Amino acid sequence: LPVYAPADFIPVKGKGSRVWDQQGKEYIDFAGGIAVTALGHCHPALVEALKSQGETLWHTSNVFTNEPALRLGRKLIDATFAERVLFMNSGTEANETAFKLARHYACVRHSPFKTKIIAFHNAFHGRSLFTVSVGGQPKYSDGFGPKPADIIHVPFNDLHAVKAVMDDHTCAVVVEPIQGEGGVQAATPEFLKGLRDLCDEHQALLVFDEVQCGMGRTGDLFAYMHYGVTPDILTSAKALGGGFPVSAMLTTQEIASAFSTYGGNPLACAVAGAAFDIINTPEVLQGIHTKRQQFVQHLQAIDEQFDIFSDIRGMGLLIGAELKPKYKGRARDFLYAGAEAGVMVLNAGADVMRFAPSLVVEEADIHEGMQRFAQAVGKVVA
Amino acid sequence: ADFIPVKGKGSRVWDQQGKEYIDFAGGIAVTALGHCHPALVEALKSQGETLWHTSNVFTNEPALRLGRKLIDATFAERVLFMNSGTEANETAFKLARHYACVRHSPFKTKIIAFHNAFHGRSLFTVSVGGQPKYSDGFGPKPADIIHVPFNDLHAVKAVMDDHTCAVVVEPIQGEGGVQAATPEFLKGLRDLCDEHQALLVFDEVQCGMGRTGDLFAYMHYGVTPDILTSAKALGGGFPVSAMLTTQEIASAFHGSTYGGNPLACAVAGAAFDIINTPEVLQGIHTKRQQFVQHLQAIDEQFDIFSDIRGMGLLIGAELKPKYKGRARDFLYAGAEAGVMVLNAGADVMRFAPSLVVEEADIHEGMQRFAQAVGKVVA
């Protein structure tokens, strides 16, 4: 079921897209700690930001603001639909704030009875009681006592189902523009635009969970930019801090007033500022699309030799490769084989291989790592 | 606040104008070793050039070392690391619920909590928290949570049954006016949890990691919980948290540690190594009395405090009826006089400085606070 590392696989050092364990074994990192290390390990710019702010100021409480948080909030506001930003520590906390806000906005603006949240099967939004209940995997939300109520789940990419359950008592639609954990499934243009129109019609807020697909992952700063569909609330984490625990919730002044920056650990925000400055450049964003195709070509060549993939999908450097029916439920086996061959990869359910490397992964590492993965595949299929 | 801190060193802070402040707040009991402590900076820099992040699939050496340190020093046999106190509390409450579900009955769901409790701001944790004003207005709350008065043992006995999974308590309610549990109350909680096969959950996010002058407040009481949560002081400024429990309870979630950010755990390790020494822990009690003597002298001059309470360097000064509801007025006057302090509700002044705050800083900061009080009274 769950993917756990054995006692002889403990990473100790990371440099760029390469990782070494206790025994000195070298790995190519196509996993990024599950799309977290978007600029690789110990990136000189991020290390410098960490070290310099570390000599100056680490922590301020939420009653105080700080320069790093102000600078970062300004950068997020200037680059996105957002007019207000709220900083926390993790994607789960960002989602908690987003869901609470959508609930409270509806409560004060319209009615205390306007509480329905529409979410999707296979959705992942975190592991707190509230976020995991909004998540679309019953197995992970079962067994913790009474779940917070008024959450309705329908299939991802099923617009009609959404239309069918939504009403004047609906406060929010929560969606990942691309379901990362859920098989790397991208929203269709019709579906995502349909969600915007339905939210408009019912006076509900459209909440985009961009914890995984945000901060450069898709080759745009945020996935919503690719679609041209503007949410009411957006959450960001993982890539935001490039390894440092930080998250952000983005919304408009009108919605935020129901509760330009709030919170944000000075050290976290300085690091996230440095990461933002690198990721939000035309050149890096262009490179993400160049690098994606380098990966895809290798995956196509692997399928040509071994006949193992039915679909190659995702956006930018969030890559999903679905296994053929003859290899249904073998994703974990391919992952472990990869680790043996010195390449770190991911799953997205039992049938899907997932890749989420550094957005600046070198071409040399792409070729070497994918050659290692091709070797690993050969060991599994023989 | 009306000023923006840009730099800190030890227990002194500077804003954009270069104005120097004495820090008796510690970012709400977070910076337990002050600002930019050389040992914590060294740990941050050394791990920061080695490895920042692994997912929960992997362990890492900093997480393993910190886990071992917490296990050796406490009742804990297993540790789960997170980023915030809210997350640690989420994990604790989910665990108590899941343990009851699989080891007893899916209907064993009642959580007993206390009025004025603070456990975080997620939907679940704020619902277990005892402040309706903070849990109202976010739609249907996670159910089966019962609130009774803090320190009321009879109330707890009354609500507990075979359908109770947990009692959740802060050994000292920091936000709730700095109110300490009585020995009989805390001991009684242990006895009742034993009787009803419920888990005793100690929220030591604020009162833990040296705050009370013991590594954890439970050690002062001699009452061992089933689950304990730690944050704030744990990382001395770095976002990190821990949930501590036994092997028996942790087994309900399907080595000795799980999760933990390499960078976070390295810093937390350096912080643990300093706080968990006989000398630092002794000093917390010395420093407490240095603060308390100033507070007593302020009251002698200005007739302002009816009670001075708390433990170690968690200090509460309740305002007299004449100054009821005006804790914010003294907080702002404090800031004007160049000293950073806290409130614990509208009636209580709260102090939570670095556990190694220099005596010179205590005297200077408290003199500034005396002047601030003087300007308000005049």
Query: Amino acid identity of A3?
Result: V
Q: Strand pairing partners for B21?
A: B13
Q: Are B19 and B43 in the same domain?
A: no
Q: Considering only the beta carbons, identify the residue of B52, B64, B122 that sits closest to A130.
A: B122
Catalytic annotation present for B7: no
Tell me the C-alpha to C-alpha distance, in Å, between residue A174 and each of A99, A151, A230, A259.
Answer: 8, 10, 13, 19
CATH of the domain at A19: 3.90.1150.10
Label residue A150 left, alpha or beta by phi (over 0 means left) and psi (-120 to 50 means alpha).
left
φ, ψ (nearest 5 deg) of residue B193: -65, -40
Which DSSP helix (H) or strand (E) runs through B364? helix B359-377
Q: Are A70 and A141 in the same domain?
A: yes
Calpha distance B67→B276 (Å, rounded): 14
Q: Which residues contact A250 (CB under 8 A, 6 or more apart)?
A: A76, A80, A81, A82, A84, A85, A233, A234, A235, A236
Q: Is B118 annotated as a binding residue?
A: yes
Its domain, for residue A323, covers: 1-42+283-382
Cβ atoms of A329 and A349 closer than 8 Å: no
φ, ψ (nearest 5 deg) of residue A161: -60, -40
Tell me the C-alpha to C-alpha distance, in Å, between residue B223 and each of A115, A215, B219, B283.
Answer: 42, 47, 7, 24
Torsion, Cα B290 B291 B297 B298, to 10 degrees, reads 160
Q: Are A94 and A218 in the same domain?
A: yes
Total count of domains within chain B: 2
First to last CA, chain A: 24
DSSP class of B69: H
Size of interface A-B (CB pairs under 8 A): 200
Q: Are B268 and B374 in the same domain?
A: no
Catalytic annotation present for A124: yes
Q: Are A244 and A322 in the same domain?
A: no
φ, ψ (nearest 5 deg) of residue A181: -65, -35
Q: Are B73 and B160 in the same domain?
A: yes
φ, ψ (nearest 5 deg) of residue A351: -105, -5
Calpha distance A40→A33 (Å, rounded): 10
Q: Considering only the beta carbons, identify the residue of A107, A150, A245 that sits closest to B83.
A: A245
Question: Are β-strands B342-343 and B348-351 bridged in parallel, bridged antiparallel, or unpaired?
Answer: antiparallel
> Which DSSP string do the residues of B319-356 spell out, in sequence order?
EPGGGTT-HHHHHHHHHHTTEE-EESSTTEEEE---TT
List the determination method.
Answer: X-ray
Contacts with B5 from chain A: Cβ below 8 Å: 57, 60, 64, 66
Q: Are A89 and A211 in the same domain?
A: yes
Q: Strand pairing partners for B22?
A: B12, B339
Residue B150's SS3 state is coil
List the structure tokens of A286: 């262009």
| A102 HSE (CA, 13 A, CB side) | 31
Q: Are A189 and A333 in the same domain?
A: no
Calpha distance A362→A336 (Å, rounded): 23
Calpha distance B49→A51 (Å, rounded): 9
Contacts with B30 from chain A: Cβ below 8 Å: 59, 61
List the structure tokens of A309: 């993939």
Nearest in space to B24 (alpha carbons), one of B372, B350, B340 = B340
List the structure tokens of B70: 């917490």
Tell me the C-alpha to C-alpha distance, in Å, between residue B292 and each of A291, B74, B147.
Answer: 63, 29, 32
| Full strand arrangement of the beta sheet holding B12-15 | B5-9, B12-15, B20-23, B339-340
Question: Are β-strands A18-21 and A11-15 bridged in parallel, bridged antiparallel, or unpaired?
Answer: antiparallel
List the structure tokens of B273: 């190594």
Q: Are A245 and A371 in the same domain?
A: no
Q: Are A278 and A294 in the same domain?
A: no
The separation between CA B177 and the C-alpha centre of its own chain, rounded to angstroms, equals 13
DSSP class of B59: -
Nearest in space to B142 (alpha carbons), one of B94, B100, B98, B84 = B94
**A47/B239 Cβ within 8 A:** no
Contacts with B32 from chain A: Cβ below 8 Å: none
Closest-CA distance, A214 to chain B, in angstroms, reads 18
* 3-class secondary structure per residue, chain A: CCCCCCCCCCEEEEEECEEEECCCCEEEECCHHHHCCCCCECCHHHHHHHHHHHCCCCCCCCCCCCHHHHHHHHHHHHHCCCCEEEEECCHHHHHHHHHHHHHHHHHHHCCCCCCEEEEECCCCCCCCHHHHHHCCCHHHHCCCCCCCCCEEEECCCCHHHHHHHCCCCEEEEEECCEECCCCCEECCHHHHHHHHHHHHHHCCEEEEECCCCCCCCCCCCCHHHHHCCCCCEEEECHHHCCCCCCEEEEECHHHHCCCCEECCCHHHHHHHHHHHHHHCCHHHHHHHHHHHHHHHHHHHHHHHHHCCEEEEEEECCEEEEEECHHHCCCHHHHHHHHHHCCEECEECCCCEEEECCCCCCCHHHHHHHHHHHHHHHHHHHC
CATH of the domain at B77: 3.40.640.10
> Which DSSP string do the residues of B277-303 spell out, in sequence order?
SHHHHHHHHHHHHHHHHHHHHHHHHH-
Nearest in space to A165 (alpha carbons), one of A177, A151, A175, A179 = A151
Cβ atoms of A318 and A38 closer than 8 Å: no
φ, ψ (nearest 5 deg) of residue B37: -65, 125
φ, ψ (nearest 5 deg) of residue B212: -90, -5
Nearest in space to B242 (alpha carbons), one of B298, B191, B204 = B204
Looking at A240, A261, A282, which one is the last position of a domain? Answer: A282
Looking at B215, B248, B278, which one is the last position of a domain? Answer: B278
Tell me the C-alpha to C-alpha distance, in Å, between residue A187 and each of A157, A179, A346, B289.
Answer: 6, 8, 21, 62
Which DSSP helix (H) or strand (E) runs through B19? none
Calpha distance B229→B116 (Å, rounded): 18
List the structure tokens of B351: 């102090």
Q: Are B357 and B272 in the same domain?
A: no
Classify each residue of B289-322 as buried b or exposed e, where b means 16 or more C-beta atoms within 10 Å of its C-beta.
eebbebbeebbeebebbeebbbbbbbbbbbbeee
Catalytic annotation present for B203: yes
Nearest in space to A126 (alpha carbons), one of A98, A87, A165, A154 = A98
Longest Cα separation, chain B: 63
Tell me the C-alpha to C-alpha distance, in Å, between residue A184 and each of A178, A209, A304.
Answer: 6, 14, 22
Query: Amino acid identity of A117?
Result: I
Calpha distance B170→B150 (Å, rounded): 9
Calpha distance B113→B204 (Å, rounded): 14
Q: Are B8 and B42 in the same domain?
A: no
**How many CB atoms within 10 Å of residue A8?**
9
Looking at B225, B258, B278, which one is the last position of a domain? Answer: B278
